[PDB]
Structure 1
Amino acid sequence: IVGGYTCQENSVPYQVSLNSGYHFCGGSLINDQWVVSAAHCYKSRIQVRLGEHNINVLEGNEQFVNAAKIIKHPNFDRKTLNNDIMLIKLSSPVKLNARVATVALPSSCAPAGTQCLISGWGNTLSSGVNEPDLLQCLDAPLLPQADCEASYPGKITDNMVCVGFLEGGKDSCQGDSGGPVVCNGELQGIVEWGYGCALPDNPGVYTKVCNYVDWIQDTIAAN
């Protein structure tokens, strides 16, 4: 997260870190046994860590659970990043509590102009790389599709939404990916991509979760 702020400890309880001997992506806990992430975050073996604040320090709220089933959206298109969504069924249920809680699937597609919360342990710099210890927060609005499309000529699909600022300086970056964008307590997006980070005119692109509620449910059910 570039230009964000350090989240109040255990304020983003649905926030999960996709670990593989290093933190490489984020995700959201949608139920005691399921995490939603980005298909570009796929790995054959993943350790999902919940209740994390400081990814480098054992603070005592952490729950570490192996991924059992890692299921990418079947129409995942690595070229375009269309359907860049994946589900992870944990090997066993987590203990929901104060710092290990779930987030609601979108009831509706949120309108442009809605204020969302983006979180992650993603790069925090606009140029070069800096990986933070503490989870980072960012308040940002959902931008009108027109601007999205304007920023990314012919690359925005209907399952993509831009969130951020046209002016730059504030954005999600590498490492935040597969991470959540929550609006009015519902998961509306997933950290997807953008050109550079926090660059003026280069809004961050996100997978539009409201386009997959069915898929998510069906899959969860079927597994």
Structure 2
Amino acid sequence: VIGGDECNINEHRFLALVYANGSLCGGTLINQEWVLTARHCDRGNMRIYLGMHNLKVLNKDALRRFPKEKYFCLNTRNDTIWDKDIMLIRLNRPVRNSAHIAPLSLPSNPPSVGSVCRIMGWGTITSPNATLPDVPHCANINILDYAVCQAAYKGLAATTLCAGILEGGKDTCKGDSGGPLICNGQFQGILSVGGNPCAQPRKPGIYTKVFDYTDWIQSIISGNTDATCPP
């Protein structure tokens, strides 16, 4: 996250730290056994850490998990960038609520353009050139008119939200992918892609639009067979 500050230690109980093949991502605990992240974060041998804040001062209740179930959309476009960038993972064992662990559930509605959203992650706080923080950084950004992302980007995927600061300066960045966009207290986005360097004016982040995936998520977790992703 560029242009933010250290998150409050208590404001991200649903935030998962996802490590796969040395690559860093965020994720969101949506109930006691399941995490939503970006499918692009599935880079191999995934370890999912819950209840983490400082990577160098471990919360007493921090836990390590790995995927026991893993789902994503099988029909993805090839012409858009990271189409349907979402992956739903069931953890190997549940994680109970604790000081630093609690799920964030499914949004009741997609967010209005203009809504203030929190972004968060352990991703770089500088761009270009990686500077990885020991603590997750958080910033407030907004849901932007989708046309802003359409103007900034080539093959923008559908089922996405455009979020950032129109003038730049605050943004997610490398290492934050898969992490949540929380707007008005609701889990609305999973970071997929954005501009590099990060936080440029009119080059917002592209967040998979969680609301659109409600049926898919519920279908998978509720056990009814071979759900389908939204168009």
Alignment of 1:71-86 (within 5 A): 71-77=71-77, 80-86=81-87
The residue aligned with 2:229 is: none
Aligned CA distance change for structure 1 residues 165 and 72 (closer, same or farther; 3 Å): same
TM norm structure 1: 0.93
Q: Note the aligned Cα RMSD (angstroms).
A: 1.7
| Unmatched runs of 5 consecutive residues or more in structure 2 | 225-231
The residue aligned with 1:98 is: 99
Question: In 2, distance between residues paired with 1:142 and 1:195?
Answer: 16
Aligned CA distance change for structure 1 residues 172 and 7 (closer, same or farther; 3 Å): same
Question: In 1, distance between residues paired with 2:37 and 2:77?
Answer: 15
2:52 aligns to what SS in structure 1? coil
Question: In 1, distance between residues paired with 2:96 and 2:212?
Answer: 29
CA deviation after TM superposition for structure 1 residue 117, in Å: 0.7
Alignment of 1:61-210 (within 5 A): 61-77=61-77, 80-152=81-153, 154-196=154-196, 197-210=198-211
2:217 aligns to what SS in structure 1? helix
User: Is the 8 Å Cα contact of residues 39 and 84 (structure 1) preserved in structure 2?
Assistant: yes
User: Is the 8 Å Cα contact of residues 21 and 45 (structure 2) preserved in structure 1?
Assistant: no
CA deviation after TM superposition for structure 1 residue 43, in Å: 3.5
Give yes or no for the alignment of 1:58 onto 2:58. Answer: yes
TM norm structure 2: 0.90
Aligned CA distance change for structure 1 residues 96 and 59 (closer, same or farther; 3 Å): closer
CA deviation after TM superposition for structure 1 residue 58, in Å: 2.2
Alignment-mate amino acid for residue 220 of structure 1:
I
Alignment-mate amino acid for residue 80 of structure 1:
I
Question: In 1, distance between residues paired with 2:82 and 2:21?
Answer: 25
2:30 aligns to what SS in structure 1? strand
Give yes or no for the alignment of 1:37 onto 2:40. Answer: no
1:169 aligns to what SS in structure 2? coil
Aligned length in residues: 222
Aligned CA distance change for structure 1 residues 200 and 159 (closer, same or farther; 3 Å): same
The residue aligned with 2:228 is: none
Question: In 1, distance between residues paired with 2:42 and 2:223?
Answer: 20
User: Is the 8 Å Cα contact of residues 5 and 137 (structure 1) preserved in structure 2?
Assistant: yes
Question: In 2, distance between residues paired with 1:10 and 1:102?
Answer: 13
Question: In 1, distance between residues paired with 2:182 and 2:62?
Answer: 22
Question: In 1, distance between residues paired with 2:83 and 2:21?
Answer: 28
The residue aligned with 1:215 is: 216
Question: In 1, distance between residues paired with 2:21 and 2:57?
Answer: 14
2:219 aligns to what SS in structure 1? helix
Alignment-mate amino acid for residue 139 of structure 1:
N
Encode CA deviations 1:163-215: one digit per residue, 9 max, x unaligned.
Answer: 11122221000100000001122111011111210112211111111111001
The residue aligned with 1:46 is: 46
Encode CA deviations 1:102-157: one digit per residue, 9 max, x unaligned.
Answer: 112111111101111111001111221111100110111100112221222x5223
Query: Percent identity among equivalent residues?
Result: 40
1:212 aligns to what SS in structure 2? helix
